[PDB]
Amino acid sequence: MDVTCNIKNGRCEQFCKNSADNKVVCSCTEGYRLAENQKSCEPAVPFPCGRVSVSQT
Amino acid sequence: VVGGEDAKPGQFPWQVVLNGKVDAFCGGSIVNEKWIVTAAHCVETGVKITVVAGEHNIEETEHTEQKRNVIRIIPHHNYNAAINKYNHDIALLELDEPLVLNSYVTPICIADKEYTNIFLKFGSGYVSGWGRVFHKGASALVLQYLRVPLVDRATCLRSTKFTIYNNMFCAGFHEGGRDSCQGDSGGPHVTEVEGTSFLTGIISWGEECAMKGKYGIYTKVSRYVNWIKEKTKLT
Numbered sequence: 205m206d207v208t209c210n211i212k213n214g215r216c217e218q219f220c221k222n223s224a225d226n227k228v229v230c231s232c233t234e235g236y237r238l239a240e241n242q243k244s245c246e247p248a249v250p251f252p253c254g255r256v257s258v259s260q261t
Numbered sequence: 262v263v264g265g266e267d268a269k270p271g272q273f274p275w276q277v278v279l280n281g282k283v284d285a286f287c288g289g290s291i292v293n294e295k296w297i298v299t300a301a302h303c304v305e306t307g308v309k310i311t312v313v314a315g316e317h318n319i320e321e322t323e324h325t326e327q328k329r330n331v332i333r334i335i336p337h338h339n340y341n342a343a344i345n346k347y348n349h350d351i352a353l354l355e356l357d358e359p360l361v362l363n364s365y366v367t368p369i370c371i372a373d374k375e376y377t378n379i380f381l382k383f384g385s386g387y388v389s390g391w392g393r394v395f396h397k398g399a400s401a402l403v404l405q406y407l408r409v410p411l412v413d414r415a416t417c418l419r420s421t422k423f424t425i426y427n428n429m430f431c432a433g434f435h436e437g438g439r440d441s442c443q444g445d446s447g448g449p450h451v452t453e454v455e456g457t458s459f460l461t462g463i464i465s466w467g468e469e470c471a472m473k474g475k476y477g478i479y480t481k482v483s484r485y486v487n488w489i490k491e492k493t494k495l496t
């Protein structure tokens with residue numbers, strides 16, 4: 205099927221870049237790492253930006 | 262914030278409150294351990310500001326608050342209060358000593374220009390602050406938050422006699438009752454992207470808070486991301 209950044213953000217959790225052969229490259233903001241599934245963003249520092257970490261009850 | 266709810270501790274850990282001549286007069290957002298982003302009309306080179314991060318209830322010590330002095334104020338280079346107090350309404354505050362990042366004191370993410378604009382286009386963001394809880398009413402003690410939908414440009418224009426440029430956006434509800442208000446200026450408008458919040462706007466101005474037919478006016482952060490990243494870089 206068609207895989208591009210314009211379709212569901214390339215299934216990237218944060219950022220998408222179009223690459224070669226109908227593929228995309230996902231990426232994340234500072235403090236996160238692209239996960240082994242190649243789409244998700246995992247924390248790479250103790251207190252990554254924009255995340256709620258305190259228990260919300 | 263009118264029509265909002267009390268934030269739980271740590272729910273908006275990037276929020277700050279500014280204190281000066283009057284306490285809790287504007288909001289801001291943590292860019293990094295040394296830098297806050299706020300509205301330029303809130304600040305002025307020469308007037309002494311303190312920032313409080315990790316705040317929740319301004320009248321109770323909750324053992325998460327970090328107070329810092331401001332050593333440098335950088336209004337956007339196109340801001341000119343003599344011409345228009347609200348155009349290019351964005352400024353950066355440098356802290357004297359770094360914040361200690363933790364679950365209660367956490368930066369907001371800032372995407373590149375393209376993605377910040379995409380995120381605003383999702384159409385739904387969260388605003389937060391200690392501003393008025395009714396038009397011309399008392400200010401909040403406990404941080405308030407509210408989800409606001411993006412309003413179409415033509416509706417946004419027909420709602421006020423003042424000019425709304427393409428670097429500003431509107432948000433709020435057709436029936437009113439839910440809006441940012443005086444004292445929330447400078448605070449964040451954020452968009453949640455799969456559990457990570459990104460800064461999409463700065464709370465700027467309005468007229469009658471939450472009045473049916475009126476909307477809150479916000480600074481589009483996408484237009485200023487490159488300037489924010491350049492000025493606040495620590496490496």
Ligand SMILES: Cc1cc2nc(CCNC(=O)c3ccc(-n4cnnc4)cc3)[nH]c2cc1C
Binds near residue numbers: 441464465466476477
């Ligand atoms: C949403 C909101 C509502 C507010 N009402 C006030 C008090 C009333 N302010 C006003 O009536 C007011 C605000 C801005 C302008 N203006 C001038 N040129 N462009 C815009 C003119 C008048 N402050 C607020 C702050 C906010 C953030």
Ligand SMILES: [Cl-]
Binds near residue numbers: 237238
């Ligand atoms: Cl990575």
Ligand code: NA
Binds near residue numbers: 322326
């Ligand atoms: Na407190």
